[PDB]
Amino acid sequence: CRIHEISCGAHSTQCIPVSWRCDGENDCDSGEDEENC
Amino acid sequence: CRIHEISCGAHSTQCIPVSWRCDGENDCDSGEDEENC
Amino acid sequence: APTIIDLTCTVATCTHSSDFGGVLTLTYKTDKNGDCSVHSHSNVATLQE
Amino acid sequence: YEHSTVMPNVVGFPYKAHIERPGYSPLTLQMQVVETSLEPTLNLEYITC
Ligand SMILES: [Ca+2]
Ligand SMILES: [Ca+2]
C-alpha cells in the first residue's frame, strides 16, 4: 500500500492509515494495530 | 505468461512486464518485485 | 499491446491556472497489464504524462 | 485562502465552520468561547467615607 498506510498483517489485504494506530479503536479485523502498543 | 513477463511469486497468478521490476513502485500485489533489489 | 474497451471519462476537480490545475480519472477494462501512450486530441487542454 | 463567518456569543456553545475550496477536501473548524469580559473605561469624580 501507501507509505502512510500500514497493512492489517500479511493475511489481510486492507491497509489503514498510520494515524489509526494506538487510538483505542480496533480498526483491524482482529485489532492487530493496538496489540503490543 | 509471455517471455517479457514475470510473475509475482508462485502463490500469485498475476504476471507483469519485466520493465516494472525495481521501478520504485509496488506494482505487484504486495511489492514482490522490489523485494531483494 | 493491451486492449481497452468501454472507456469513460470524468473530471474530479479543475481550476484554470498556470500550474497543472486539473485532475481527471479514466475507467476501463482490459485483458492484460501493460503500458499505454495517452494523448489529448485538442488544444484547449494539455496533459502532463 | 481567506474566509469569513459569524458565530454566536454564547459561552460553551460548540461552533462548527465549513471550509470548501476547489482542489482540496473540505475542512471543519471547531470554535468555542470559554470566557468573555466587558470593561468600561472610567474616570473618577470623588470618594466618600
Ligand atoms: Ca486503532
Ligand atoms: Ca516495480
DSSP collapsed to 3 states, C1-49: CCCCEEEEEEEEEECCCCCCCEEEEEEEECCCCCCCCCCCCCCCCCCCC
- For C12, the closest chain D residue by CA position comes to D23
Amino acid at C35: D
Closest CA to D10 of D30, D29, D36: D36
C-alpha grid cell, residue B12: 500469485
Residues B5 and B19 sit within 8 Å (Cβ to Cβ): no
D33 near D11, Cβ under 8 Å? yes
Q: What single letter denotes the amino acid at residue B12?
A: S
Among residues B30, B31, A3, A16, the alpha carbon closest in space to that of A29 is found at A16
Residue B28: closest CA among chain C residues belongs to which residue?
C33
- Tell me, what amino acid is at A8? C
Q: Tell whether C14 is within 8 A of chain D (Cβ).
A: yes
Interface contact flag, B14 C33, Cβ < 8 Å:
yes
Cell 470548501 -> residue? D20
The approach used to solve this structure was: cryo-EM
| Continuous segment of H or E residues that includes residue B25 | none
Q: What does this entry list as its resolution, in Å?
A: 3.5
**Nearest chain B alpha carbon to C2:** B17
Q: Report the distance separating Cα C34 and Cα B5, nearest Å.
A: 10
Ligand nearest to the CA of A33: 1
Total residues found in chain D within this entry: 49
Amino acid occupying residue D40: P
State the Cα–Cα distance between residues B32 and B12, nearest whole angstrom.
Answer: 10
**Which triple of cell numbers denotes residue D17?**
465552520
- C: neighbours with 3+ CB pairs under 8 Å? B, D
- CA–CA distance, B29 with B14 (Å, rounded to integer): 8
Could you tell me the CA-to-CA distances from D20 to C17, D1, D12, D27, D31 in Å, in that order?
18, 10, 26, 7, 17
User: How many Å lie between the centroid of ligand 2 and the Cα of residue B20?
Assistant: 5
Distance CA C48, CA A19 (A): 32
